[PDB]
Amino acid sequence: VKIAHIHLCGCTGCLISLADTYEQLLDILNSVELVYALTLVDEKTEIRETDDKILIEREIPDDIDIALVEGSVCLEDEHSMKDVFDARRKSKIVVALGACAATGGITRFCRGGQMSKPVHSSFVPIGDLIKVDLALPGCPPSPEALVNLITAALNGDTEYLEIYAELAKKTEACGCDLLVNVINKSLCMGCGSCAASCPTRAIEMIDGKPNVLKELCIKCGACSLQCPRIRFPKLIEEIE
Template structure:
């Protein structure tokens, strides 16, 4: 039985809500895994050792030594460490600190989990959709490396925004105009104009959901075969 844990750092619990919102799909997954730790759903005080997958939501407060120790602990105890949601994957709204201001010495400093410890996968979104969470867990259980590749790249890079989509796809005339990026954006920062995505930078929270969901980035070989 695959052992899975959910750990929460500095977050709003939105990612946990998405995980719980998988409903019957979560029940299907629970037939294949054993959820051994979750601060909100279970009365377990210590994170067990030798876990297969640990889902971590929230950014790491660099002024809190307990948060730093927890980040190191989950890295040591997980075979696959997953940064769940924009805060853990790229920093999300915590990048802006207070009131959309740039960080100052008087403010607490937050960094995404991907910049504090090495993560194997990162699931973007604020919060990530229940379907993506289910698909990533299922792909990890089945060893589907092709599906997991963009999530692994996001974990390694630790940074993403709508500008990446423009640079990698639109500016290279690779966009198919499918609208997947606009549908995936949690803040509606992407609008389709004349069949092409237009990124509203003032609304973009740099979660990376658009880049990870773009078929051109996720399945380049498959798209080439179809064309």
């Protein structure tokens, strides 16, 4: 199994969360073969020498089986868009890793105005440009949620991954997903688990309902993924 970590306009936090499997990471790294990851390996090096220049480039390799793509795409940066179409072509399964890649996340707030690239202002999730097969929300998703994705993908546990594959079709995330889809639809019973999932503590249970402090939400989508009144696959009911 050839795995690759592609880094676009992210922060590497999702990669660090993968590294926070520690002992499971050594297990994981010997079952798959990490062929590309600019932060970890020296691949893929290609040299082209003329009479005036020596070009040592690190390109994306081919045969990539699963590509963990982290961060959003900057439309005003040619390299950023060249690499998101590159990863799709050279990979069979493309995983939007984290809210930045899956739904925009914090980069939704980007508006530009800051040197040194004053023209950079338009950031979109990778799903707005290429096909996404699986999507992991959160900022960052937990290491435990990561090992489950990787294990299911290697064991073909398509029943487990269904919730993320369905999630790959949606490119928008916000705390208002709890209101629009649960509170407003007369489905919220007030368990409070959505509040416990939030990384910024933007959710506050009041009158038995979640109350989103909008100026603290980073649009990571962890709360709407957690709500058992949105998605509740039957496989969860199986416990030992």
